[PDB]
Amino acid sequence: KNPKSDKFKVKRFHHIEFWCGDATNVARRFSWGLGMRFSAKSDLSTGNMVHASYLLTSGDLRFLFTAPYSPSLSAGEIKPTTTASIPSFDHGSCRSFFSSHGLGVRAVAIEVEDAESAFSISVANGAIPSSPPIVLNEAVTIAEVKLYGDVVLRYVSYKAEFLPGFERVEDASSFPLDYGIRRLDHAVGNVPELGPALTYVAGFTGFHQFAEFESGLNSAVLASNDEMVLLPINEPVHGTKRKSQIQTYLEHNEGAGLQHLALMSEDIFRTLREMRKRSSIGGFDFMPSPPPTYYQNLKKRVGDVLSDDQIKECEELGILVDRDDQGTLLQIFTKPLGDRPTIFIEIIQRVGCMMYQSGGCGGFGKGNFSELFKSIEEYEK
Amino acid sequence: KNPKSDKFKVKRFHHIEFWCGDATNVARRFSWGLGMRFSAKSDLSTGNMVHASYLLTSGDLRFLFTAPYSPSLSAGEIKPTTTASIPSFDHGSCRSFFSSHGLGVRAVAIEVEDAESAFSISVANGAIPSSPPIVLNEAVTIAEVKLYGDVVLRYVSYKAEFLPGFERVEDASSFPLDYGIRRLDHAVGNVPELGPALTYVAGFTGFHQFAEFESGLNSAVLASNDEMVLLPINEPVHGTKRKSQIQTYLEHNEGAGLQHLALMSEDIFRTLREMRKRSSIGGFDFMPSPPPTYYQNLKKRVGDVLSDDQIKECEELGILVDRDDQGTLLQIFTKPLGDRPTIFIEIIQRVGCMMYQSGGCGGFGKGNFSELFKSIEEYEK
Ligand SMILES: Cc1c(C(=O)C2=C(O)CCCC2=O)ccc2c1c(=O)n(-c1ccccc1)c(=O)n2C
Ligand SMILES: Cc1c(C(=O)C2=C(O)CCCC2=O)ccc2c1c(=O)n(-c1ccccc1)c(=O)n2C
Ligand SMILES: [Co+2]
Ligand SMILES: [Co+2]
């Protein structure tokens, strides 16, 4: 059931901003490993004396990487005279975020009809303000509220290319990489307590709980009206045999934050072939693959959706498969993106729920906790 | 003239340590862009709760990338009980270094006969101590003194694989990249005042001035007995037409530090082909190439050392060429390695001075300041 209780008009995920120590090196690594092109920049060469920000794109997916310069370069500036292209940026906040959490997501940005309105309504409904609405070149409005931990939910709205003050990157510096990733499907937070986290965010957005079907977690999913913005949230379950990966996150991340970004591919097989070719030459590594019993067990579960060849292709690439009552999910998880066992990426593709495909078709793979366990025991034979 | 006045026995450059915000992402980028394999690690998976350190190698060149974890992971430790593999590491120092300078070199490490002796003698001769000699697993001794700014000169000596507590990386995670780079030729510091910098370092090492032949700089080179350890130092020259690149460095770096690392290739043509193929897919960009007049002018200067084809190959790759009285130098410079216009890399190959090749054969390319200027004017025709 979907009560369509959004308190302001939400369109789509717009972008994800990483706060880095060196934006250049993270962005170049992510570009190669994920097949995203360099699309826009705001840095010293564009007149920004405050921060370096580089934008990667693949389809509609937008990854922004930002790091502070020396405060000495902009010491004479004040907010009215700032050269920063993202007015919510603050040197002290960025250094404190990164020193506290390491590399990770600072902003989950969604496009809305009116960012000023979304901010006002959100704050009126319990949101903790983080950066007030600011109109950029009379063209774009951006505002931020706290989501969980030091992660903010960023609203962006356009009167009518990324943001004013960003320049389109030189054609020669912009190699057209593409491994098939097309948009952000969902963005997941880890928190110590799921209940209060859910009440707060659903409180100020109006997002409704998205319907699901000892793994170390309890989780729930918040969703916008058309269920295209999906924000799952996890809490640990303690006292378990194997230590909870949610708890390990909170420990190494110094508290709550974004756990994983799930990127939808138009062809998960090609995406995984391309990413795995690059794992040991600068790209991303993947979780260890399930045993062959897991793939033997796929004939019975989804043998009506995937052929034997497509199931064998899943096995070659370590892909996981789960199923709802409305659709099927193909998924795989990377190892952590940086030094700490905190943030990782999920690659996904959804089959079914055609009307356009409805959001969350096939779920989020919680069925794969059971099947991975049974599979491991099966293989132990 | 070489008075061979070293105050302790120095062997070779051993390694360069970068202090990073996220060592994983910098190391993966450098590996792909320079063609260096992952050779050793010390991180959570090896029991190091203090820092993540990853070692890349190409031939004898050793790049170490280190970043701190949350201090909370090791809050119960004391130096006697440390899990750090590099006992000189300090969370506060590393965060302060990186927040002050951004990505750059923390340690220039040289192998010596006896690191304890080199430390004692250095300090007795004016060196500012930074980390006292510490014996690792009764096998390796490491000690550090200040070089310039927040850069240290690290001494390492072995009784008899990188350092104790480092593990050799998994074969599958260690792809055998190699674009022909083989060793560190020289490591260059930028300082506000060359005179005091030279007197200090030559004071405590015994290194002698290495013989040279409005570019924005004055420079001098310090060298060990066999002139295989080469430490050039630059200071700005002010009041010039075009602003001094040494001054821009000092401003953006918040003071003195390492300007460039020069990496010797066994085949600079292949190295530059391989690096340029990767510039826009995660690797490194190069300075804009000299005009064709520069290469037309190469026939007269070095036409007895390089064929017409080799000169044309230099022109295809943007390589610079300079000449001593004893040898010839092929060189090219990358754009800055990270966000700030501070540290960059030089690729070089030296021709001549065969006895083994003697160090610094052909110089450091200061002749290319003149030739680049004349070339630009020539081309302006
Ligand atoms: C993160 C994840 C998801 C996932 O995306 C996700 C959502 O989108 C929102 C709902 C909660 C949730 O979990 C699905 C299945 C996973 C995992 C996962 O992390 N692990 C795992 C655990 C410990 C070590 C290695 C892997 C799994 O085993 N399964 C089977
Ligand atoms: C750094 C460099 C070197 C070099 O390696 C080096 C040493 O090893 C030690 C002695 C001093 C020194 O300079 C040689 C020649 C260079 C440059 C250089 O930086 N530039 C440059 C300047 C401004 C913008 C872009 C490039 C040059 O034009 N030349 C021609
Ligand atoms: Co997910
Ligand atoms: Co040089």
Swiss-Prot record, chains A, B:
Gene3D superfamilies: 2,3-Dihydroxybiphenyl 1,2-Dioxygenase, domain 1. Keywords: Cytoplasm, Dioxygenase, Iron, Metal-binding, Oxidoreductase, Phenylalanine catabolism, Repeat, Tyrosine catabolism. It holds the Pfam family Glyoxalase. Pathway: Amino-acid degradation; L-phenylalanine degradation; acetoacetate and fumarate from L-phenylalanine: step 3/6; Cofactor biosynthesis; prenylquinone biosynthesis. Its EC number is 1.13.11.27. GO terms for biological process: L-phenylalanine catabolic process; tyrosine catabolic process. Residues 12-158, 183-335 form the VOC domain. It catalyses: 3-(4-hydroxyphenyl)pyruvate + O2 = homogentisate + CO2. GO terms for molecular function: 4-hydroxyphenylpyruvate dioxygenase activity; identical protein binding; iron ion binding. Belongs to the 4HPPD family. This is 4-hydroxyphenylpyruvate dioxygenase. It comes from Arabidopsis thaliana.
